[PDB]
């Protein structure tokens, strides 16, 4: 669609800046469990994607995604309500543009949640697995979101992903969980992206687990790559919405409903957690 180059991203950023006076410091990509956080944003300005020229379009059953501006724990945020998952067939530019817009809008930290299957056998339903690293299967293939001409305006041709999941933010998130009595739910792990949209087969899960993957999802990494590429610090957490089935004999099967259910059930806690992290961001 529209190339996530500086010209287009500026155009979109400027259109947004006309619509809100909130200069976001924190971008929040609303994933599993963050539905309430998005909702609890203070003094919020809600801008439907449909109202932002050249902003990529996505919907939940026809309802446009929204950019939500306002504050959260006294910090200025922009919340993306409505993501651009690659299994939907969105282009690299589509996925990248909103993140690069965040960059120009002033976002310094991106916080993202997602739903993931627990590969690591110690994980429990409802666990939070803070991403400390990832395995970008599509990226290792030739489906890295950065494939194509590099937009030098945003980042370097060969971005390193050394400390992609900012260790300081991870430490803070863990501390906030600990201080608030749910440190036991919080783990740190390697998230592997399956392009999807099929859930992983038991053989695939077994393989991924053996690759050193703790959780598996179909999202997030592309956004993270774009965020890191343009120098936005990233905090990302997977909500373990289901325990990956490694056994082909099992009759138990992953399903989006239980994924949604776990997200819905953990939303209040995840909101509290994110709000309390935001409150303590440097």
């Amino acid at each position: 669609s529209v190339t996530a180059n500086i010209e287009n991203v500026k155009k979109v950023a400027h259109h947004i800046q006309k619509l809100t006076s909130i200069v976001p410091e924190i971008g929040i990509i609303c994933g599993s469990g963050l539905g309430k956080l998005a909702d609890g944003v203070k003094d919020k300005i809600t801008i439907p994607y449909t109202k932002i020229p050249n902003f990529p379009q996505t919907s939940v059953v026809g309802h446009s995604g929204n950019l939500i501006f306002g504050t959260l724990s006294g910090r200025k945020v922009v919340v993306m309500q409505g993501r651009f998952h690659m299994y939907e067939g969105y282009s690299n530019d589509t996925v990248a543009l909103p993140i690069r817009v965040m960059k120009l809008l002033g976002v310094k930290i991106l916080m993202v949640s997602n739903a993931a299957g627990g590969l690591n056998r110690s994980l429990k339903l409802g666990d939070f697995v803070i991403l400390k690293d990832h395995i970008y299967l599509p990226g290792l293939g030739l489906n890295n979101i950065l494939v194509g001409p590099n937009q030098e305006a945003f980042g370097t041709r060969f971005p390193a992903l050394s400390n992609a999941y900012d260790r300081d933010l991870r430490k803070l998130a863990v501390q906030v969980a600990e201080e608030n009595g749910f440190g036991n739910l919080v783990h740190q792990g390697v998230y592997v992206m399956n392009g999807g949209p099929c859930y992983e087969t038991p053989a695939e899960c077994t393989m991924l687990l053996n690759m050193g993957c703790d959780v598996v999802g179909m999202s997030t990494i592309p956004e993270v790559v774009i965020a890191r590429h343009c120098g936005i610090q990233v905090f990302a957490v997977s909500l373990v919405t289901n325990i990956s089935v490694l056994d082909v004999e099992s009759d138990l099967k992953p399903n989006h409903e239980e994924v949604l259910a776990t997200g819905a059930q953990r939303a209040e806690l995840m909101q509290s957690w994110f709000e309390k992290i935001i409150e303590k961001l440097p």
Copy 2:
């Protein structure tokens, strides 16, 4: 290619339904070892893909063969669409979704695969009990794109993708028919291809828990499972994968075809005998 949506798929199915009075309950995708299967089909009509508007075209044209096999109404796909050929997701998906509309409840598919598992012998049958969809994991899943809701859910689970009941039946059929010793169950990994796997790739795949490696089938399986078609899939081990970079052994497509053809009669009989035994 034309989108494998319900409107287009309906149109194709409807055109086909005007060409045959046979409501197939079993879809068969002929892969390695399934050459002489079309012959065994009775009350059969052969519909060249060329005769079906908006049906994908592949090679002589591919044929949609309807008729009765072992007392059961079948549609047999003669000519498949392999992703390494550059076919689109929609192209590969449409025939399976057409099968769905035509009434197919079970998809039976054979393919040729390299034997990674070191206990496999040339000419063995490896019933797929699971798969590793390397292209799918890497963002080339056949279902990438808007989900066609008339067919299935956005995020299909693949848990019993290779129907355990069909697998059990296939194994029982092989055993009672004296070739149980040829039959394994294993994990099929898809290499997009069209290169055979390097020794290093094979070693990696074997260590990933893969028993056989092929360049086909998974995309159809995914589409079949997405739209609720039960799947039975078997790989004929047409060659033993070479894991050793120092080895002079190597896959050869002619030998692969030869091995497949050699097993064709047995594979046919097996499929026929499985179909005969399917619950009615």
Copy 3:
């Protein structure tokens, strides 16, 4: 861009053949040599109709042999198509290339590797290829090769043996390893988790290039010699403060790598 079929490749080859009399026997792709080939004819890509543009084809003699040096690669992470990446290699085939020598930069996965080490590729793991981004995906160009190429001895064992002997006799055999190159489509460097996974996949070095060219080369019957310069040691622990294209390691080893290539070419069998 233009389909890397026999017609288009012929057009380009024929064109190049008007611009030079040099029939190359060896094709060379330097990643991390061309600056020093005798009686060199420097052909800018821009001067070659239908030829991909990013860039020079440098024809001439190297260590007594006619070579074509490809200066300027087409990397998949750049968004170049399969046909674009393949065409230069198929052009080489048409030009007379029988041996392709390629060097590249790679991260050292194998823990025994040191910065500046040479890892001769003896095999590869084509992650994009396994995942449906194989350069050969699409109609097979039958004039060049078969539909399903085997990749047996893809990294010609005799050439590897020779390269090792040359390194040995020239007193830098200590630097030379052989191993498996895995391609990450890129352009991101691999995360520690990814490196760990790749290492455990049996990968010794990781880069973002080369395999597609090698695949095309093998597809059309060109012998391949490929070496990775270990330009950095892959970080496997996400807890480290250590990947950067600022490297540099290539500059350090440039003259050595170049001398090695020259000396290999010197010893190559000649029909």
